Write a protein that binds this DNA or RNA. Structure first.
Lengths: 281, 279
RNA sequence: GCUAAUCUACUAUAGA
RNA sequence: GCUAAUCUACUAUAGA
């Protein structure tokens, strides 16, 4: 019943431009003004935990434009991806092959790809990867709060203290996040304990085969006057396996969903973009 | 009245020699034959979980001799470190040294350092690092079993499956290991659950600041076959915003700074260096 | 640039 | 070569 649309955009600037932080802001404007698919306003303004919307950074060459600082200054073939779920017909809108104008300047947007999938059909994919090593690549700065794997019982005890991010991703944190997102996506509540136990159990019984990670500092804007805001997250890749069949299946399932909506905080602004890959033994 | 001896050795080979795997075996020999501190023999032969003994690999320069993915010359300054605890009268034997002869060949052993600390005086040090970022450097391949942070309830459920090592050091996993080793050091049982909770909680309330880690594969011999395993090396810098947790953690960590971390410290794995940063 | 990981009388979340 | 990281309607294990 619920399903995900992942649309691949081609964005070209006409003049030379300095992109804001984060770079996804441009497209947000197109939504926040009802220039591109307005039926997302609520979703883009939403403050609900683990909301099912992902608006990626633009990416030049085979990379997503890193921030922390400066400019592109050149009309070129930029890339974008937007992923989401909701009962509102997106197929009615989309289109748009001409140019648009923002407070950030003039852009020409196109569509390169359309992918639509129903979340229950991805369970079909899972079975063909039950003998693969799972490699998760963080193609954008990924922010994983540690408290996510805190026992729900002590939630109020440490409710005030902000422990910050685990810039070193455990398997359990990744699958716990994937689970939370999946869960909010398919409209299942009171799930804290299932999430907690899933994460703990998963990284207690996971085998980490290889990895190449690096901590990065991400800038996320100013707001309001006169501040300036910025976090620490992770980038790179990680390859692991879960010898338990049931655990592996659940994990693969949730992970496939995150392969569209992203992982960790705060996917709503382009963070936590991931690519899923596999290897045979 | 528990305490730790850490002795720093200077090892020179006399002939051209090929080191065994692991290289710590050389020093291990001096104990299993009563050439060095014989009162440790049983400890080297012991199979007790988290025994308080660490006998490091040999090392040329600041680095520890990595293994067959060779041979050292007639004269070469190798280094060694051994740390331990026990109530068995060793107090004398420590000093011991000279030119000993082993099945790996003939060596000249010296002493370039001797440190003794009692675990009770360490907590004072704790108090001055209560505002520091804690940096743990793995100067040798460190093996961290993931099941350490498995809920003790399901211990029997998965007693057979061997999940292997987490080559990705969790803050909670390393402090859990530190806790277990410390606990065994001071003679405490029923720790499984306290350890579990400690690790889970610390991993939930930790902030990881920076790191440079890389997975490595180490070989440990054959006997029949060929033995090998996967661990981690590099460094990791973190902080724990909770006072009680940070206190406990630093405490256990100081001990692991002598006895090593994870398994199996008895043969040179999990050698760590503890460092700090002021904020 | 390198990226699967192992033997044992299960103390095996151990010891080598 | 480089390794601290935060603003808010505490939905804050969130959203930007």
């Amino acid at each position: 019943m619920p399903l995900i649309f992942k649309i691949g955009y081609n964005v070209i600037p006409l003049q030379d431009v300095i992109l804001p932080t984060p770079s996804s802001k441009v497209l947000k404007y197109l939504i926040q003004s009802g220039k591109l698919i307005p039926s997302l306003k609520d979703l883009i303004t939403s403050r609900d935990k683990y909301k099912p919307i992902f608006i990626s950074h633009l990416g030049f060459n085979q990379r997503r434009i890193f921030q922390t600082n400066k400019t592109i200054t050149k009309g070129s073939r930029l890339s974008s991806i937007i992923a989401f779920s909701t009962q509102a017909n997106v197929l009615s809108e989309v289109a748009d092959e001409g140019i648009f104008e923002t407070v950030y300047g003039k852009f020409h947007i196109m569509i390169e790809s359309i992918e639509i999938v129903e979340v229950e059909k991805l369970k079909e994919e899972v079975e063909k990867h039950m003998n693969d090593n799972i490699r998760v690549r963080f193609v954008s700065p990924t922010l994983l709060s540690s408290k996510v794997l805190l026992p729900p019982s002590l939630s109020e005890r440490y409710k005030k203290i902000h422990a910050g991010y685990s810039t070193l991703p455990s398997v359990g944190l990744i699958v716990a996040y994937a689970y939370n997102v999946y869960c909010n996506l398919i409209g299942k509540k009171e799930v804290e304990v299932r999430a907690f136990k899933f994460g703990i159990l998963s990284n207690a019984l996971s085998r980490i085969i290889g990895y190449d990670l690096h901590p990065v500092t991400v800038a996320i804007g100013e707001d309001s006057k006169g501040n300036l805001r910025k976090a620490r997250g992770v980038m790179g890749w990680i390859e692991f396996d879960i010898p338990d069949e049931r655990l592996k299946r659940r994990a693969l399932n949730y992970l496939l969903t995150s392969s569209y909506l992203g992982i960790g905080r705060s996917r709503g602004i382009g963070f936590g973009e991931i690519r899923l890959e596999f290897r045979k033994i």
